[PDB]
Design a binder for this molecule. Structure first.
Ligand SMILES: Cc1cc2nc3c(=O)[nH]c(=O)nc-3n(C[C@H](O)[C@H](O)[C@H](O)COP(=O)(O)OP(=O)(O)OC[C@H]3O[C@@H](n4cnc5c(N)ncnc54)[C@H](O)[C@@H]3O)c2cc1C
Ligand SMILES: Cc1cc2nc3c(=O)[nH]c(=O)nc-3n(C[C@H](O)[C@H](O)[C@H](O)COP(=O)(O)OP(=O)(O)OC[C@H]3O[C@@H](n4cnc5c(N)ncnc54)[C@H](O)[C@@H]3O)c2cc1C
Lengths: 150, 149
């Protein structure tokens, strides 16, 4: 992967405001800000890479900024952070992973519980929410994920 | 990360987020953003002057940025834009004007319906809501107002 990052960063705050103000929410999130564990992935770049991760996300997973950026979030699904696309995970529910995948392909809001692993190998249940986000052009370009341990 | 600062070094999006995530809301505002008529006033400057006004506010009141910045928002209480402090308004409920006043001194959220006039003198009912806001120090430094016709 050779993910590129938007020079000048991302309008995280503008996207959080966009999400809280969306007209027909399929999932209720309640108020949110940059304090939770969250990430933004680029839907238009190869294998939907992470182009931003809040500090709470790094704190929750144990990985640093350098270790997460430019990677598809699926690496958390393995205690060794090694998960090849299309692979049959041995520690994660296949239907769960397929649900996330179809929701993303369709720009449809989804919410699931997925088994994840921290950098030190510690297993936990991630209560994950993904919401598609429109950029300045008005079309879906990114996806915002909200991660919660338990 | 891209923090868009609005023309003074003001983090308007940051405060909108702060306001929507406040722990003890005394008034439901529902989601809000910069596409609505809002303004920011500096509580630590003489007579709580407007330091920021969105384009929607300027459109709704007919006044321009040069005509509103640095002024107390009470000028809308008169069809000529002239209102001296402490004065007994002749077109605005005295009780309402006092409610806003005390709420602001106490940094307490408030929502009211006040009579206002656009720059051209057109009278309209403003459904105003004011919420105190904390700056980087964690203490109330500004107040954001949400105006609705
Ligand atoms: C903003 C954002 C944040 C994210 N945050 C996280 C996070 O914190 N943690 C996390 O674990 N993931 C996270 N993800 C998810 C991750 O990036 C992948 O999207 C997810 O693993 C699903 O896509 P995939 O590419 O891995 O699918 P694939 O690798 O293709 O895997 C799909 C699996 O489903 C099975 N499958 C496929 N079709 C069917 C079918 N018809 N019936 C039954 N089984 C089927 C397959 O056998 C396969 O093993 C996030 C995604 C986004 C966009
Ligand atoms: C962010 C923000 C946004 C705002 N947006 C608007 C807006 O869109 N429109 C608008 O009109 N205002 C707006 N305001 C309010 C305005 O700027 C003033 O705060 C408001 O008019 C009250 O303060 P004052 O200084 O005018 O009070 P004063 O000049 O002191 O007037 C209060 C009035 O109440 C009467 N009064 C006082 N005490 C009593 C009493 N005990 N019993 C009976 N009567 C009494 C007085 O006789 C007087 O006429 C906004 C304020 C903020 C902070």
């Amino acid at each position: 992967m050779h993910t590129l990052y938007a020079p000048g960063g991302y309008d995280i705050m503008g996207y959080l405001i966009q999400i809280m103000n969306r007209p027909n929410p399929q999932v209720e999130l309640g108020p949110v800000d940059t304090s939770c564990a969250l990430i933004l992935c680029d839907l238009k770049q190869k294998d939907t890479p992470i182009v931003y991760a809040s500090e709470a996300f790094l704190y929750m997973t144990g990985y640093s900024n350098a270790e997460v950026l430019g990677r598809n979030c699926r690496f958390l699904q393995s205690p060794d952070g090694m998960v090849k696309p299309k692979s049959t995970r041995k520690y994660v529910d296949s239907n769960t992973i397929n649900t996330m995948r179809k929701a993303i392909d369709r720009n449809a809001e989804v919410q699931v519980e997925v088994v994840n692993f921290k950098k030190n190998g510690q297993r936990f249940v991630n209560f994950l929410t993904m919401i598609p986000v429109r950029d300045e052009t008005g079309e879906y370009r990114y996806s915002m994920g909200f991660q919660c341990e338990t």
